[PDB]
Amino acid sequence: HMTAIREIRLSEPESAQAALLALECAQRYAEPDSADFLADAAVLAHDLPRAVRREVERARLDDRLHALVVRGNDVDQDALGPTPPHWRQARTAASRRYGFLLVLYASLLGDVVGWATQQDGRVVTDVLPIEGQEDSLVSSSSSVELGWHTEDAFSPYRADYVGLFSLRNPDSVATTVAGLDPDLVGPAVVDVLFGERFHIRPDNSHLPTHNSGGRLSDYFAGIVEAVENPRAVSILRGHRDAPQLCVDSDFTTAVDGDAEAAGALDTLIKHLGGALYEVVLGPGDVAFLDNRNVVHGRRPFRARFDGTDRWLKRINVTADLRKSRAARRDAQARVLGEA
Amino acid sequence: HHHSSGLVPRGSHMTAIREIRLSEPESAQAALLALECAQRYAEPDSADFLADAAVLAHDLPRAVRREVERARLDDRLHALVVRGNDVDQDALGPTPPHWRQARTAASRRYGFLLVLYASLLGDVVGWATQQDGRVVTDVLPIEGQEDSLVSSSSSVELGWHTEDAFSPYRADYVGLFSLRNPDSVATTVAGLDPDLVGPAVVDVLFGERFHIRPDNSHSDYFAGIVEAVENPRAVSILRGHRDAPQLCVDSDFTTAVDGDAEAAGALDTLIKHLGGALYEVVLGPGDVAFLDNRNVVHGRRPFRARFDGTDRWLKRINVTADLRKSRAARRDAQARVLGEA
């Protein structure tokens, strides 16, 4: 589909209008995931520029979308200061405005959520290279490619959209994206991928090693259960003309003894691995990946660890907050796995 | 004629009814937006309008949008009620004798306004088997269906249910826009208060121990509808968090699984509880309600239809929080009619 990537470039006035709204939110509320802000966010998002809201709404109802990309938001690089050396230190005063703006864009597409087992249950999370994580399989990697995956592929509560706000990307490091064309794998493999014949385990970002050590063991009980005893699940679901995709290149296996399923997974990985294409998010570019339609990753790069490194804000968006209520502490709570 | 909003409790449900009263300026703003939409778009459920509806809805009065957004995230809501929209009774003309004659030029502006309010809560959908797959449907009494089990009834109690209880694609909200209601006829509403029911009965209702069949009201889709009557799936009546369970039950079309006497018991306990807990919502002309179909059953009590063009008349809509999830049951990405293909 020619419109699989939908791009809006902000005019200077539209950029200024989005920046002023984000700064008004920063003046009113403490954190971009403060409960009072999140309660108000869907209505505050309505004050974003009309031309932007029109294009976001076209993207939201496009069931073949790969990504909506909003180019040219204002980022004051001098005021932002250095790229933090760890996500734990990335909730900086100077970066609050970008957190608020990411939530406002996201709230046009649905309701923002976080995970108890990712970056200590923060709703606005940070993607930046960490010294000693170069060769890890998590978003803080650099030297090793971030393997392509559906975000939280293991979970029935996985996001409908993943939002990425690029604060800085001096070496133009590419995000990687792929969808599945059913006609190009054959109806034989599509039939197999629709079967509950696969195990999808949680990725390494959900491990205690990528959260603060003081976090309750019991936050991880659900993750540990999903690693040890994965449910038999499909990779494709929904309409044959527009199937949803759910797979993680590093954490998906066929069920033991299902040679036909193992073959279809092998075929899918080769198809997606090759079709995987690049989107570069420059400073002030915001992307929303349709997590029902595409896998994503990130190209390998060399981090300088001098405060100049690539830095994205990330958010998960659900079309239907109500459906995850069994996994949330209370009605307004946005952190999946607190129940 | 000032703006006001508040929480109206029913039993232990402290936010059961979220009520909004429009100011005269808010009513005029909403009316002007609906009239502008009626000038620029073919139909309140045409593809051109529905592609834009969620953005146009952002032009409704801000104070109303804040209160609607609070209702949308209230997982214990029964009914959001917005009172005081403009209805020009003289210009509207008589209540049509049948829904087939009810998509009138004079009533278009009210269909547009219902869709604008609905689009603050989610995406509007219809059903291939209901009023020719119209998204904006019509509720009015039909002569010769006084004693019918459907929304065109009058003399007989419309028996209460979750809307489309049998279906995994059932609406999150049912919307009603009252055009006229001279005898103050009510919608009946009930939710479960788990503090009034034995915990053991609640545990049974969470079990996949029930059959919910379609009404006779209701092809890969229609193959599923025949199977739904003949070989119904074992489903639960309650689902989700114990602190905020969703309800799905039909007083006339729900049974326990063959041989499950305990489930038969729990079901009849629930039917007696909801029957006893029914309360009424009356919508005057220009009053709009959204029932949270995840939380409440609804019905209607007997009333006296004259069939002289003065009868009660509402516009009705179904809203889903997640349009994408029903794509297997819709014709194409933008089509809103469940079971169309």
Author numbering:
A (entry chain A): 0 to 338
B (entry chain B): -12 to 205, 216 to 338
Authors' description from the paper:
CmnC is an α-ketoglutarate (α-KG)-dependent non-heme iron oxygenase involved in the formation of the l-capreomycidine (l-Cap) moiety in capreomycin (CMN) biosynthesis. CmnC and its homologues, VioC in viomycin (VIO) biosynthesis and OrfP in streptothricin (STT) biosynthesis, catalyze hydroxylation of l-Arg to form β-hydroxy l-Arg (CmnC and VioC) or β,γ-dihydroxy l-Arg (OrfP). The overall structure of CmnC shares similar folds with canonical non-heme iron oxygenases. The catalytic iron is bound by the 2-His-1-Glu facial triad comprised of His148, Glu150, and His295.
